[PDB]
Design an enzyme around this catalytic site. Structure first.
Site, PDB file in Angstrom:
ATOM      1  N   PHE A  18     -38.492 -38.867  -4.624  1.00 56.73           N
ATOM      2  CA  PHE A  18     -37.736 -38.951  -5.906  1.00 56.73           C
ATOM      3  C   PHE A  18     -36.318 -38.391  -5.716  1.00 56.73           C
ATOM      4  CE2 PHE A  18     -42.280 -38.137  -6.719  1.00 56.73           C
ATOM      5  CZ  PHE A  18     -42.625 -39.292  -7.387  1.00 56.73           C
ATOM      6  N   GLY A  19     -35.771 -38.531  -4.507  1.00 57.48           N
ATOM      7  CA  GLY A  19     -34.529 -37.844  -4.109  1.00 57.48           C
ATOM      8  C   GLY A  19     -34.513 -37.458  -2.639  1.00 57.48           C
ATOM      9  N   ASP A  20     -33.331 -37.541  -2.045  1.00 56.11           N
ATOM     10  CA  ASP A  20     -33.029 -37.055  -0.688  1.00 56.11           C
ATOM     11  C   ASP A  20     -32.254 -35.737  -0.806  1.00 56.11           C
ATOM     12  OD1 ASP A  20     -34.164 -39.366   0.504  1.00 56.11           O
ATOM     13  OD2 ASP A  20     -32.287 -40.462   0.193  1.00 56.11           O
ATOM     14  N   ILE A  21     -32.475 -34.854   0.162  1.00 55.43           N
ATOM     15  CA  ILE A  21     -31.823 -33.526   0.291  1.00 55.43           C
ATOM     16  C   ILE A  21     -30.775 -33.637   1.395  1.00 55.43           C
ATOM     17  CG2 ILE A  21     -32.232 -31.061   0.483  1.00 55.43           C
ATOM     18  CD1 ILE A  21     -33.889 -32.589  -1.735  1.00 55.43           C
ATOM     19  N   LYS A  36     -29.480 -32.115  -3.665  1.00 56.30           N
ATOM     20  CA  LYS A  36     -30.441 -33.193  -3.975  1.00 56.30           C
ATOM     21  C   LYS A  36     -29.706 -34.216  -4.821  1.00 56.30           C
ATOM     22  CE  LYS A  36     -35.361 -33.776  -5.322  1.00 56.30           C
ATOM     23  NZ  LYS A  36     -36.602 -33.000  -5.603  1.00 56.30           N
ATOM     24  N   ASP A 126     -48.743 -29.695  -7.103  1.00 58.05           N
ATOM     25  CA  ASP A 126     -48.515 -30.316  -5.772  1.00 58.05           C
ATOM     26  C   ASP A 126     -48.483 -29.218  -4.725  1.00 58.05           C
ATOM     27  OD1 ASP A 126     -48.534 -32.549  -4.265  1.00 58.05           O
ATOM     28  OD2 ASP A 126     -46.364 -32.760  -4.206  1.00 58.05           O
TER      29      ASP A 126
END
Ligand SMILES: Nc1ncnc2c1ncn2[C@@H]1O[C@H](COP(=O)(O)O)[C@@H](O)[C@H]1O
Length: 292
Positions: A18-21, A36, A126
């Protein structure tokens, strides 16, 4: 790229769902950060949701600091404290073997991180080794928890009215560490974060769980096979050859009622007494600290 005036975007260091860092620099402070990014036009926007939960969590030990949230060009942006490798990454670096001492050092902090989240009226949902990261530098002895994408309020901030019992829930999170109650489709609560931690600790002890790498074509059949193996593996069989505390911990979690406040202090004291019986010191010398 310039972000929020004072942040410079560097290269990707991680890919979430739900996103790249990205590595970044706080140009004003002379400090590295993690950035992010979420495509504004993403089908399922979550970053703004995650940032709201982090704001409620702020000031916790082992909660990454949020430095800045905004939009920039085609991205929603969250700038945060730069953390180190995940416990999964460090497990792989350690040849998928942790010493008892390392498992117990980790267990102590991981129970405190989960308790902290629960104190802020959320369950994480999670709990897995990929979502715990060691800090860097001065924070290098500290276990952090990340990824509040699936986190949910389990009680009213005001009344502490617990969410109602519910069934026929589809399986939220990673099946490998999911509670038996999650496999049964029961609404997750505080107990489920802690039962998942218990599987994570036996995962570190064993190198794998008995319900890992089971063959299925489709995904719901894979989850049913994981569910069947989990429910047909007694805790004393799962934990055989390891100190009794790992079994006691899991039996305690499995005994909790939906709305029970876990006795976090009892669970930490269980591992602390074992730690002391082994003659270990809380000196934060983890297995990975001794790689040359
Ligand atoms: N603050 C952070 N510092 C360093 N790596 C991070 C950070 N947050 C997430 N990651 C990495 O990014 C990936 C997942 O990002 P996320 O979507 O935030 O869970 C994994 O490879 C994590 O190790």
């Amino acid at each position: 790229l310039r972000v929020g005036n004072r942040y410079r975007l560097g290269r990707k260091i991680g890919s979430g769902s739900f996103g790249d860092i990205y590595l970044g620099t706080d140009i004003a402070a002379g400090e590295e950060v993690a950035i992010k990014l979420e495509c504004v036009k993403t089908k399922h926007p979550q970053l703004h949701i995650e940032s709201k939960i982090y704001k409620m969590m702020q000031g916790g030990v082992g909660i990454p600091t949020i430095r800045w949230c905004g939009a920039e060009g085609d991205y929603n942006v969250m700038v945060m404290e730069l953390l180190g490798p995940s416990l999964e990454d460090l497990f792989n670096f350690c040849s998928r073997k942790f010493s008892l001492k390392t498992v117990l050092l980790l267990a102590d902090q991981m129970i405190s991180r989960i308790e902290y989240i629960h104190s802020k009226n959320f369950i994480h949902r999670d709990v897995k080794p990929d979502n715990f990261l060691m800090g860097l530098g001065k924070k290098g002895n500290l276990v952090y928890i990340i990824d509040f994408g699936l986190a949910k309020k389990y009680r009213d901030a005001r009344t502490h009215q617990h969410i109602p019992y519910r069934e026929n829930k589809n399986l939220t999170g990673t099946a490998r560490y999911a509670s038996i109650n999650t496999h049964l489709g029961i609404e997750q609560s505080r107990r489920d974060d802690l039962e998942s931690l218990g599987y994570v600790l036996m995962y570190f002890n064993l190198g794998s769980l008995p319900w890992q790498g089971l063959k299925a074509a489709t995904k719901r059949q894979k989850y049913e096979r994981i569910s069947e193996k989990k429910m047909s593996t007694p805790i004393e069989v799962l934990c055989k050859g390891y100190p009794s505390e790992f079994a006691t911990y899991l039996n305690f979690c499995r005994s909790l009622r939906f709305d029970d406040k876990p006795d976090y202090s009892y669970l930490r004291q269980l591992f602390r007494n074992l730690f002391h019986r082994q003659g270990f010191s809380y000196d934060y010398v983890f297995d990975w600290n001794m790689l040359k």
